[PDB]
Design a binder for this molecule. Structure first.
Ligand code: FES
Length: 98
């Protein structure tokens, strides 16, 4: 394991702290753990799984849907994200997306 990634959307209950590695897509790291987050496509071709990495670093790469401005303003498409350090994420941001 390597990274402790905390996941919160205070108003949704989720306020767990999970261990992830720099090779586990945060989405899966969170589902091993038993809290069940958002996802549809599981491939960077959408937005349902979106979060805003409050502080820290991630690698999206794999993403096909978020455009630059959206990634500069904190949007993470969790499902295909690998943690790059420790990071706290807000779990559900699609209503607010664009
Ligand atoms: S579930 Fe569609 S990009 Fe994450």
């Amino acid at each position: 394991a390597t990274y402790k990634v905390t996941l919160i959307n205070e108003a949704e209950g989720i306020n767990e702290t999970i261990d992830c590695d720099d090779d586990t897509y945060i989405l899966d790291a969170a589902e091993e753990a038993g809290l069940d987050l958002p996802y549809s496509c599981r491939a960077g071709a959408c937005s349902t799984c979106a979060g805003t990495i409050t502080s820290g670093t991630i690698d999206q790469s794999d993403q096909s849907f978020l455009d630059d401005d959206q990634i500069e303003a904190g949007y993470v498409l969790t499902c295909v994200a690998y943690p790059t350090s420790d990071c706290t994420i807000k779990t559900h941001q699609e209503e607010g997306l664009y």
